[PDB]
Write a protein that binds this ligand. Sequence first.
Ligand SMILES: O=C(CC1CCN(CC2CCCCC2)CC1)N1CCc2c(c(-c3ccc(C(F)(F)F)c(SCCN4CCC(F)CC4)c3)nn2CCCO)C1
Length: 219
Amino acid sequence: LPDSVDWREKGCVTEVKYQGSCGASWAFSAVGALEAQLKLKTGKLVSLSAQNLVDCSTEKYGNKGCNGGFMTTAFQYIIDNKGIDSDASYPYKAMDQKCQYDSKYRAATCSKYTELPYGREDVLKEAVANKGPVSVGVDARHPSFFLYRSGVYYEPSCTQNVNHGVLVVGYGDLNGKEYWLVKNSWGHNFGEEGYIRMARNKGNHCGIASFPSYPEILQ
Ligand SMILES: O=C(CC1CCN(CC2CCCCC2)CC1)N1CCc2c(c(-c3ccc(C(F)(F)F)c(SCCN4CCC(F)CC4)c3)nn2CCCO)C1
């Protein structure tokens, strides 16, 4: 129930990444969510390897590397694999490569993941407050999304059908405009230092609360 949350202020969010020509936003959404749970448990902030997911969380998990994927099955791959490599050791190349997972460089683990009910922006607010950053999809197929520079994003022709993976690391209000605080993966030059504030409590705007999920690392 805090009116604003920003998980960057708790040291739980790594640097904004740059996906480039590879459609791996699902992998960035996944590692970003797990990175925060990693920080909470261990005190260490370490970027996790999106490339590991692109190359290894593939056909068994319904994913297609640079041609798309699910965050939930990415999570499941980490559970099945008993690990995910650090980004430093397995860095992002923005292309489809052979799986090169090496347990020697394991930087995190995943115990479970939770999916939130469709459209429930109230449940999403609670989870971001009481659990941490939440992986979500948004409908990003709008020039205005690409052109966004600052403020609370509102797109009248936006739909609830998601197509782009992002990370909800907070929420709040700017002079009564409620927004979601969203980490994108288009580098630092997009939006507000790589972030976009998207309208909140506007009937699941851009589908932000259509398919939320978040992972956990248990004791
Ligand atoms: O995660 C889940 C759970 C499902 C339920 C179980 N099945 C079974 C599956 C089949 C066998 C192998 C593994 C298990 C997969 C995960 N969702 C449930 C429904 C759902 C989700 C999304 C969703 C969520 C986030 C994003 C983001 F953020 F990336 F943009 C996108 S963009 C499209 C991603 N998509 C991934 C596969 C292919 F690359 C084509 C591209 C879509 N859309 N939809 C509706 C259409 C699909 O029903 C999230």
